[model samples]
Every structure is written in structure tokens, then in C-alpha cells.
Target: MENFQKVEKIGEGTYGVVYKARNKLTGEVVALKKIRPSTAIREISLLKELNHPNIVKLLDVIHTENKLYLVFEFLHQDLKKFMDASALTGIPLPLIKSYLFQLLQGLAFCHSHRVLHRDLKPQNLLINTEGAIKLADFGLARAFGVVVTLWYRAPEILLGCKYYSTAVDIWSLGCIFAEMVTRRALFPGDSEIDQLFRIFRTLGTPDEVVWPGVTSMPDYKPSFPKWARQDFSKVVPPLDEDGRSLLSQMLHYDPNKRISAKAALAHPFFQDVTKPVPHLRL
Candidate 1:
């Protein structure tokens, strides 16, 4: 731990600043996340419990008198940076499918273990030299239960329900998928209220008949006018038939109707996906 050399600052994470580092013994590159005692407690506890190839590997935890350092496998860049640099208009359909498949594969693993990644954005998905993607950042991750963060958060949470599950993560996957093809956030909003309105605009506001108990949500008060019908093609114009099909399933307003991560893995979007491979191994 003492011999690893700091290379450069990666980015500011929720709890700390991340830096690229290299091990002195094996010369393996890694990312070091420096955290305060309070943050380290949660980071260490959560990282130790969750393990998956598509998720960032927690290499080691180094403690100093004033700071705690979490070492992780170094990834070249995140999806946010990649998307910004690449020409969005020309991205091939197959490549998009591949990324979506990998994203769901990682989410499925987390759900199976009862973990919820509250925050799922392009910035959290890291890509390495082999063009593989890994889900990183466990600072906001928690064991599946009722928890919600705006934006990627699901309707059940927005409704003030406290017994939600991994379906929340599936909602985020749908948002990410829509962003990939549109080159913009599907429901970019300035606030939680605005976010719900944006979602309702596309999916239509749910009523008691369609969404039981919706009227009782802590913040729920019928605001947006309901749309009589939905046109998937207009909602996500860039997606092909298969991609739109998968996106629709993930974005279902009713969490009960939303496809579970495991079931999503069997979707036709990944029909061509070969045996699962760890993003890091690739």
C-alpha cells in the first residue's frame, strides 16, 4: 500500500476525490478514492458485501492517520466522457445494444444480491481499453429496501412508498438507454416535481385505476394532465424496434409491471450476447 504511486486525479466522487495510481510491486494500475472517516465507514462496509465483474473491483483499503484510501481497478474513462468525445449521430446500433446488455447484466447481479444502486448515470459507467463497461461508484449504493434519489428514482419512491426494491434501478436503466440514443437526458428536470412531470409527459400521469395508492404518495397530488395515449416511436425516436421494446419494459410506470433485471437479461436485446464476461477481464 505504501509503495503505490499516485498518478493523477480522476474526478470528485460523492464522498471523495479519486486519483489514478499504480502499484509498485506488480505495476498494475488502479484508482484510489480518498475519503473521510465517516464516508469510509459506509464505503468499506458496502464494497465488502458486493462483488461482481461488471462492477468496479475494490482492490484494497489503506488507512492513514487523517484519511482513508480505497483502491480500485483503474478504468480508462466513463460513459459520459466517451459519449461526449464520440460523434453521437454515427454510433452503430449494435454497439448501443452491446452497452445496454452489459449495463443490465451488471444491474441483474446487484438485484440478485438485493443491492440497489440509487444513482445510475453515464458518469458512473466506466469503460476500459477493451471497450467493456463497468458500473462504478458505491457511495450511494445500499442493500435493497425503500430508498430514492431524484431523477433515476422510480414512481413508488416518488409516491413516498417505503417498501420498494431493485425495480428502482431498472427505472434508471430505462433513462440511461433513452439518453444513449437521443444524446440527451430523457427526462432532464430542474427539480423532483419537474422530473415527475417530465416522466408523466411521456408515459402519461397515472391515476388510481392505473396506479393504485398513487393518491396517497407523500408528495403526490395530481399535477400533470394525463395523456390519452402513448406513442413509443415518438417518445424514443432514435431506437430501433428491438431497442425500443426493451426500453419500454424498463420504463414501465408500474414497478410491478417493470421487468426484473434477471428477466431483462433474457430479453432479445441480448440475444447475440455470448457467454457473460467480466468487464474488467475484457
Candidate 2:
């Protein structure tokens, strides 16, 4: 750790106080997270196992007599900070598309490895100087565990899902894409009931057909108020037709109906973003 010098405290995470740091030898910036004992081992083990361009790279780990630190390549900002600074009118459509594409690529890689990112929100999506988005933090994610999130929790998890799958990440991605279009959380609920109501108010209550086998969930109840399904145009007013189509697939109540990360990459919404760079044509 001699080469790394902590600059300042950046923020608090589920397990540690994150800090901005600089490498004296290479002069490259990095983040050092002072981790708590129990979760430190779990997170370190998982971070080392996963590797992809859009996933936060764990460069090194430092263990002291009484402290553990995880070193990560620095990101310029997080989606939350960028979103908070953007116009409520909306971020540029191209930028949104690019960000979404990068996000899906990272998630697809994770799912293909059979790992689930149970917690995904704007705060966890790190943005760099090149406008790249990298998914970070894995305190509440693994193949199997309690699914926990703030406003981005999925219906299945809210209803007490016991199984782990990729669909759980898709729901959170939908919420993020909606926010990029509207500059605010689509569902900012204060509690589980409030959150579920916020979702139902847009997608309608989950009847047996809407979400097959939903009744088996521990918290699934039939007593909620009914709601009409709102059109995607109203939910994400600025999204194009292809954008709306993909959003619907991701936000679907049924996990099976929700688009997978791999399949979502093939959606029409990303066609423009996937085109070859014109600058390379020469």
C-alpha cells in the first residue's frame, strides 16, 4: 500500500468508508474502501471472481493488522451524481442509449457467470471520463441470498422470492432507464407497500396471469388496489418507440417475460448505439 495515498473520504457504502486515492508511482487515481470484517471477505472473494469491461475492476486488496482495504480503479462519477446535475428535461437520447447498452453488457456477463446483482441502482453504476458505465458494489448480491434494494427492488423480491435469477437485475435496469429519460426515479417509494403500490399504479396489480406463480411468494397478497396499465409514452415521455418496446419487456411483472440481458442487447433501441464508429472509417 506504500504507492497508494488516501486523498479524502468520498462516501459511505454498505460495508465501508470509500476514499479517493492516488498512486505515487503511476499517478493513476484509485478508490480505497475501508471494509468491515464479515462482508469484506465475501465482497473480495466475489470481486476477484468476476471480470468484465463494464464491471468495476478490483485492482488489489490490502490487509493490515486490524483493517482491510479493497482497491478499485477510479471512476469519475456515479449515475446518481450525474443524474442529479442533469436537466429534469432529460439526458440526451444517444447518451442514454449508450449508457443502457453498456449496463446490459455488464449485466449479461454477470448473469452468464450465474451471479446475480441483487442490488443495482444509480448509485452503484459508476461513470468514467469516457462516458462508460461500470456496475459496482456487491454487498447484497450473489447466486442466492436476500434481495435488497432501495427504490429499485423488483416485485418478485418484494414478494419474497427465494430463487435467484437475471430477471431481478432487469427490473432495476428498467427503473434506471426510466430515470434517465425523466430525471427522477419512476417509483420512489418509502416502504415495501408504498414501493409495490408505486409499481402497481403503473403496471397494474399482478393477477395470476400477469405474473404466473406469484401467489406462492411469501408476501404475495391479493388485497391490493387495482390499477390500469399506463402507456410507456407517459411513463417515459421522451423515449422512442423502440425504447418503449424494450422498456416494457424489461419491466414486465413476470420474470419469464422480462427480457434477459443477452436478449435485450439485440433490441432495436440499441441499434443506433451499436453502429461502427464513423471516425474509424478512414
Candidate 3:
């Protein structure tokens, strides 16, 4: 801590607490995450391979007697705070599309490298003053492993799938896309069961045909209500036909049927939108 001056406590991360700090020598602001050595190693290793402009950059790593600190580029706020500030006037279509493009680009890079973001909530998405959004908090990331926050968690995970994939991130991105448009959570469930109910209520209850082996899921119960899927135009009024189409693919009931991040980037929704540079190419 001698070389870095702690400015303020950012917030508690999934595996550690983070602080906004400044380098005492260079005077550059950065985010310092303090985590247990055991948990720190995985994030540090995974982050090293996940370099992208849409992904937060790790600046330095420090080892002390009892704590390991990971330094990162400091962004002013997260998507959660940004959306809250825009509660009055929802984000415009073009801006929302831009954010979605950036998100997909980052996720595509992660999936291509066999990484799973596990958690893709708005709070983990950092935003700068220039309106650039970067995926942060790789502490929950894993290589082709199971995982998201409850609201953004994919149906397969909620149903207790032991072996999951990058589709989990796709579900989260779907939730985020809707939230970006409406400025509110699409499902917003309080508990595991409630989360499933909320998703079923909007997307209709799943069956063996639409979602094969769904009844065999660990948490599946015949007692659950059977509902019909609602119209996207009605559920997400602000989205256009292309946007709704892409969202539908992302929120597919079966993980295998869910759209891939790479495919999503090619969706008609982004056909006319100017895309960001390929940051991971370098």
C-alpha cells in the first residue's frame, strides 16, 4: 500500500473488496482489488489471456504478507450506476445498440478462448467518461465452467445443470439487453424458485419438446405452472423487430439453442450499427 494511495473504497466484489487508488509515483488512478492469495491466482491467470478494450485492463499485481492486491484501470462508474442516473430518460436505441455490440465483442473473445464470464451483471460492467463499457471482475470467470447474478443467471443453471457452458453468459447478456432498453430488470426474481417462475411467466413454461430433458432437471417439478410465451413487442415495448429477434435467440430455453456471442454480433440488429475495433486481435 505504500506505493498506492487509497482514494476510496469502490465496493465488495464477488471474491474480494476493491478500492479506487492512485499511484503515488506516477499519479495514475487505478482500482485495487484485495483478495485471498488462493482466489487471486485464478483471476490473475485468466485475466492475462482476456485482454480487450471492452475488458478492463489489469495494471499491476502486488504480493504482501497476508494480502494479494490486483491493480486495474479505474473507470468512473459501472453500468448499474449509469442506468440509474438515466432512469428519467432511457438510453437511446443507438447508444444501447453500441453498448450491446461492445459487450458481445468482449464475450465472443472470452468464449473463443474457452472462458466463461459466469457473472455478467451491470455492476461488473465498468464504464468510462467516453461512454466505453468494459467487462470487469473476472474473479468469477472460469474456463468452460458453470455460472451469473440471480437476475441474469441462465435457466439451465437455475435448474441445476452440473456441466454448463458459455451459454450462461448469453442469458446474462440477454437480461442486460432488455434492462438497457427498459432501464429495469426483465425478470428480477428474489429466490431460485421465484426466478424460474418469473422467467416462465414471461417466456412460457418449458416442456420436453421445446426444451428437451427439461423435466429431468434437478429442480424441475410437474407442480410448476404452465404458461405461454408472451410477445416480445409487448414485454419489451422499446425494442424494434430486429432487437426483439436477437433477444429471443439469446433467451432461448435450451442452452444449446441459445445464440452464440459471435453469431449475435452478426445479427441484423447490428447490421447497420458501426462496430468497435477488434481489440483482442492484437
Candidate 4:
């Protein structure tokens, strides 16, 4: 940190600010994320072991006694900010497909190593100008069990399924896929109840007929509104039939039916995902 020169503050964290800085040794730009001792400290431990093209690279970790700083290869934007700016201009289908492909690739690697990212959303996806979408941030991640997040959380989690698996991340991927295509979150709900209804409204309310384990989950209610499945094309107009079919499988009500991250990479919808070599130079 003494050798690193601060460029500017990039983001505000729950405990401190994340700053963009310079590595004088290599003259490389990096994002320095400040970690509070009070915050969960597992990310650093797990990040050190993860290495993949689709996962953000950790260059250095600085310990200053007063604070901990993580040095990550800098990406100019995150998917949330990029999509916000894309507003009506819209993202190209090839780029959107490419991003989702990278996302699944990273998830597949993490899952293979028994790591679970409890939090997966546009904010955690780092997007560089060279069409690279590397998965970043692992504060809520765990090796296994009780993976959780609101909008992207799997229905099994929402219904209080304590013993979960890698399928939860697949559910989050489905939400991210829909968001990229629609330019908005597919299930933007206010509360758990509202979130469940938002999902039910699209895929239709389920019973054991559609979701077999619904009867035993912690929060399953008998009074959930029963709605017929809505046309997904209407939900995400930019998605084609192939895209819609793949998405439906990922967003399946029964967690058992959700596609694995590795399997998702082969879906026909990703046939044209641009394979242009990622230019490292920003």
C-alpha cells in the first residue's frame, strides 16, 4: 500500500470505500477493496485458491494492521452500471450471450471446487471493455450450505431449504440471464413473500404437482396464488426461443430440475457467443 498511489475512490462499502489505485512496481491499475475486520473474512482465504479466466485475478493482499486491502486486476465497469447506461440503447445479443457464458464458466469452476457463491448479481460481475465478464466479490461465499441472496436466490432457499447445493447458483444465473436480456431484474420484489409471488406469477404457483418438496420446506404456504405460466418471450423480448428454453430450465421451480453451470455452457442459445480473444490492455 505504501508503494501504491491512490487514483480515486471508486465505490462505498458497508465498512469503507473501495479505491482504484496504481501499482508503481508494474505500473498496473488495480482496484483496492478495503475489508473491515468485522466483515466476514472468508473471501480472502477462498479467493487465493480460485484461478480461472472468467474469475477475477487477485494480484496482491496488503495487511496494514489497521485495515486489509485486496488488490484485483481492475475492470472499468460492472454489469449493473453497464446495463444501466445501456438503458434503451441495449446490449448486443452476442455480448450478452458472451457475458452469461463467462458467468456460467466461472460458476462451474467454483462449483467443481465445492465453493458456493451465495451472492451472484450484476454488481458482482466485473465487465472490461474487451468483452470479459469476470466474476468478482466473494464476501457472501461459502464452501457449501445455506447459500442465500434475495432476488437471485433459488426458490428452495426462499422456502427455507437449509440443505442446499450448487443448484442455487444456477437459479441466480437464470435471474441474471433474464436481466441481461430484459435490461432489468426479472424478479425485483420487495420482500420474501413478494419475491415468491413475483416468481410464481411468471412460472405459475406450484404444488407437489410441479415442485415435489414444497410440502416440507420451511416457508411453503398452502395459499400461494396459482397462476398459469406466462409467455417468457414477453418477459424478455430480446431472448429468442432457444434462449427462452435454456432460461426456463435454469429457473425451474424444482431445484432438482435446474441445469448445472457446466451444462448451461453447451445450451444452443450460446452458439454465437463471441470468442474474440480478450485484450488485457485497458
Q: Root-mean-square deviation of each candidate, in angstroms?
A: 4.2, 4.3, 4.5, 3.6
Candidate 2's displacement at residue 196, Å, is 0.9
Candidate 3, lDDT over the whole model: 0.83
Model 1 sits at a Cα RMSD from the real structure of 4.2
Candidate 2 lDDT, 1-282, residue by residue in tens: 576788888988766789999988888888887765456466656667678989998777777677777788888788888887675545677888888999999999988877677889998898866667899864344512322346898899888777757898999999999999988799999889899989999988888888789878889877778898887689988678999999999999988889999999999888879422111100
The Cα local distance difference test for each model comes to 0.73, 0.81, 0.83, 0.78
- Cα-based TM-score, every candidate: 0.84, 0.88, 0.90, 0.85
The digit string of per-residue lDDT tens for model 4 on 206-279 reads: 78888887888898887777789898778888678999999998988888888999998999988877854333
The true-versus-predicted C-alpha distance at residue 102 of model 1, in Å, is 1.4
Better of 2 and 3 by lDDT: 3
Candidate 3 residue lDDT tens string, 1-282: 788899999878765789999999999999998863355465566566568888888777677676677788888778887788778887777778988999999889878877677878999888766657889765345521222358998999899887778898999999999999988899999898999999999999999999999999998889999999887788788688999999999999999999999999999999878533222211
Regions of model 4 farther than 4 Å from truth = 1-3, 13-16, 24-26, 37-43, 143-149, 276-282
TM-score order, best first, reads 3, 2, 4, 1
Q: Comparing 3 and 4 by TM-score, which wins?
A: 3
lDDT of 1: 0.73
> What tens-digit string does per-residue lDDT give for candidate 1 at 33-141?
7763455455566666677778887777677666677778887778777666654453355666777777788888877766677778787888876657788765344
